[PDB]
Amino acid sequence: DVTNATLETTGKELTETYMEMLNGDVVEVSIANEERIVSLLSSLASANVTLKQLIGTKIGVAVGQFLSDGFPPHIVRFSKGILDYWFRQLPEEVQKQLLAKRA
């Protein structure tokens, strides 16, 4: 697994990068921020994250912000694949509760 501290600082930087890019309602995507987003996310694309770390570090929430309308689909696909992987690794019945409460 990954340490809580790595996930937590990465989550904080992701959220700060996200908030910086919002010009009011509109997402502004610089070359440098596009590249900073990829760098932060690709450190998490190799992490095995536990349910407890999802609860405590909020790393899934911080990655999920980049599924919003203003971000390039290259970044949105990356965020989606990272979260898909973490969700699938959860125990099957945990997947079922989170899903069933949602239907």
């Binding site: 349910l51 999802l54 609860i55 899934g60 929430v61 911080a62 990655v63 999920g64 912000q65 599924l67 919003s68 989606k80 979260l83 898909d84 973490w86 969700f87 997947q95 509760q97 989170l98 899903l99 409460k101 949602r102």
Partner: peptide, 14 residues
Amino acid sequence: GSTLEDLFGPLFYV
């Protein structure tokens, strides 16, 4: 208990 939104944010879906 935890919801999918608690863990993955309000935009994620399976």
